Amino acid sequence: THIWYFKGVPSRLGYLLDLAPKDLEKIIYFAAYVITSVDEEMRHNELSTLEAEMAVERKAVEDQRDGELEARAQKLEADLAELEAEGAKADARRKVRDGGEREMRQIRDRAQRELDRLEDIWSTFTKLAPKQLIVDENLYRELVDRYGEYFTGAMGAESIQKLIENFDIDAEAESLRDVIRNGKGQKKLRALKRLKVVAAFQQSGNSPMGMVLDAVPVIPPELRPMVQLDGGRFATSDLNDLYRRVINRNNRLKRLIDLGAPEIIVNNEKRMLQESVDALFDNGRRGRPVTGP
Amino acid sequence: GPTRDWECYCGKYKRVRFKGIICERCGVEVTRAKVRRERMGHIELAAPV
Amino acid sequence: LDAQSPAADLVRVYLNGIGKTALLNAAGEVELAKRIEAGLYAEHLLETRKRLGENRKRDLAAVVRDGEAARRHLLEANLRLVVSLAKRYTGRGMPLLDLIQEGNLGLIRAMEKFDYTKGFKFSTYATWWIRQAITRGMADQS
Amino acid sequence: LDAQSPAADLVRVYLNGIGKTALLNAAGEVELAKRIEAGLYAEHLLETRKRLGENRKRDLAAVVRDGEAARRHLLEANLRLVVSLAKRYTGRGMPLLDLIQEGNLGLIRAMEKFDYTKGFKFSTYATWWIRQAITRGMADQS
Ligand SMILES: [Zn+2]
């Protein structure tokens, strides 16, 4: 992505894609996934079947937790009866009873952990739509595992590219015009700004896809003159240094993807590449500027 | 429909977790007893009336 | 070679075939039948949410295989009981083989249409069904 | 909304991503690598005795999946060590990210061509390989 946009004030991407800067930067630097497209009508046809499948699975976790609770409660009751038979002091009775009660509380709370996770999964499944965000990777991992069928969501610049190219401008422009036709100044000003940006896009005759680059150019060599000192040292404009960094990192990416490796390293490496390109198009725009000497 | 609720004639799918499933062994559907109240039958005539 | 050999009793073949049985003492049978229930539920859901392409696409098939295996043992569980009850009703002219076969049919008709439903030992239910089946067999033989 | 937010350090993202690691104390790594060996042997035999139609036709595929999973964790095992060794060789002008990435490449090149062979802790071997890789990176940077 082009540093001049996801960091600019106003951030053209934020207005066009109606995303907060926090979410956009998390998406760009590979922090939190995004949901691209969802065949909502296809999910709707079996929404009842999905809910039934939910009922049976949640009843299954209910049955396992109930069995565990029954087993542990019977064990504690048997232990208390044994202690009474031995005629031990009430201190031992309360120690064992508190231990067992805390064990059962922990068991029930873990059951509740599973149940609340399941309802979170559902909630996020049913009320699911584009432009939504999932901060935690584990929950998304879970979603794609249990239901990896309907919604396809990836992380990185290509995610934004697919979202925008799949996105349409005229419909949003009409909706914003309709909102403006109404009142409610508070939201009306935001609608006005977004409509201005979208109308500029539409009138330009271009497409937003220009905000995601695949081929940066390089200026001629003379513009970045190369200088030889008494010892022939390289002390010319660092433009050569920045291009060195970008090219080197791209070649590392290519070699690594050729060799094969898990997602973590590849994603980290892509983040590093994005950082370098942002630095080259501008140093010090955001974050610590690079400093060699 | 079934005389009882969530009960196949033959007992093959008597468990609660079956809705919309017609039992091939007995050829009946599994839904609450209420559905018995809202389904009809038509007799076929051999001579118009 | 062409030396002759004695025949073998049919009952003894049955005993040899069932000697591998090992009753589970009526305790684990409930989970044994929870394997069948989950198997049938896997059956249904396999052909209801068909589109889903996932690693789970094999787990349910494994649950169906577990259900097929869980029945193959449950049926083995009760052959001693059925043979005993059959032998209890001999002496009426029928070969013990025909009665025990009929009881075997009655059992298979039973357990496959039985639910724990927080019920008692399934052995009582099997004894009842096989007894009814063998009584019907004797009555129809006349 | 259009309020601005501060950026995030790249290193902290790495720490968050690797916080899930849990070293196995060098003890279970041998079986961990026996899962990879058996996986590769499943690879070969899957495409060598192809005709066989059997229930085992899925077990070896599961062994290959176990081998794929066993590596995904083994690699996670050593990221703390590689980041430490990389940080030990800083201050020469390179961003820590480039050095740690290079060490990551060196590690993946190592362990995937390593055998226990009744060898010592694989941590020493990984440290050696990543140190050589980062030294080479620094040397070629000049
Ligand atoms: Zn039926």
Curated annotation (Swiss-Prot), chain B:
Report residues binding Zn(2+) 1: 8, 10, 23, 26
Induction data: 6-fold repressed by starvation.
Which top-rank group of organisms is this from? Bacteria
**Cystine pairs:** none
Q: Which family does it belong to?
A: Belongs to the RNA polymerase beta' chain family.
Job of this protein: DNA-dependent RNA polymerase catalyzes the transcription of DNA into RNA using the four ribonucleoside triphosphates as substrates.
Q: How does it assemble?
A: The RNAP catalytic core consists of 2 alpha, 1 beta, 1 beta' and 1 omega subunit. When a sigma factor is associated with the core the holoenzyme is formed, which can initiate transcription.
Name of the protein in its database record:
DNA-directed RNA polymerase subunit beta'
Source taxonomy: Bacteria, Bacillati, Actinomycetota, Actinomycetes, Mycobacteriales
State the covered range within the intact protein.
53 to 101 of 1316
Swiss-Prot record, chains C, D:
Motif interval(s): Polymerase core binding: 98-101
Q: Where is this region: Sigma-70 factor domain-1?
A: 9-43
Q: Which residue stretches, if any, does this entry annotate as coiled coil? A: none
Q: Where is this region: Sigma-70 factor domain-2?
A: 74-142
Residue ranges of the region described as Sufficient to interact with RbpA:
1-142
Induction (free text): Expressed in exponential phase, peaks at 10 days and decreases after up to 50 days in culture; induced by detergent (11-fold), heat shock (23-fold, 45 degrees Celsius), low aeration (2.5-fold) and oxidative stress (2.7-fold, SigE and SigH responsive). Seen to be induced and slightly repressed by 10 mM H(2)O(2). 2- to 6-fold induced by starvation. Its basal expression is largely under control of SigE, probably via MrpAB, although other factors including SigH also play a role. Half-life of about 2 minutes.
Give the phenotype of cells or organisms lacking this gene. More sensitive to SDS (cell envelope stress) and hypoxic treatment in vitro. No effect in human THP-1 macrophage-like cells, intravenously inoculated BALB/c mice or aerosol-infected Hartley strain guinea pigs.
| Domain of life per record | Bacteria
Family to which this protein belongs: Belongs to the sigma-70 factor family.
Q: Assembly state and interactors?
A: Monomer. Interacts transiently with the RNA polymerase catalytic core formed by RpoA, RpoB, RpoC and RpoZ (2 alpha, 1 beta, 1 beta' and 1 omega subunit) to form the RNA polymerase holoenzyme that can initiate transcription. Interacts with RbpA, probably 1:1.
Q: What the protein does?
A: Sigma factors are initiation factors that promote the attachment of RNA polymerase to specific initiation sites and are then released. A non-essential principal sigma factor that responds to cell envelope stress and hypoxia. Controls a regulon of about 40 genes, with another 100 genes expression being altered during SDS stress and about 50 gene being altered during diamide (oxidative) stress.
Domain remarks in the Swiss-Prot or TrEMBL record: The sigma-70 factor domain-2 mediates sequence-specific interaction with the -10 element in promoter DNA, and plays an important role in melting the double-stranded DNA and the formation of the transcription bubble. The sigma-70 factor domain-2 mediates interaction with the RNA polymerase subunits RpoB and RpoC.
This chain's protein is named RNA polymerase sigma factor SigB
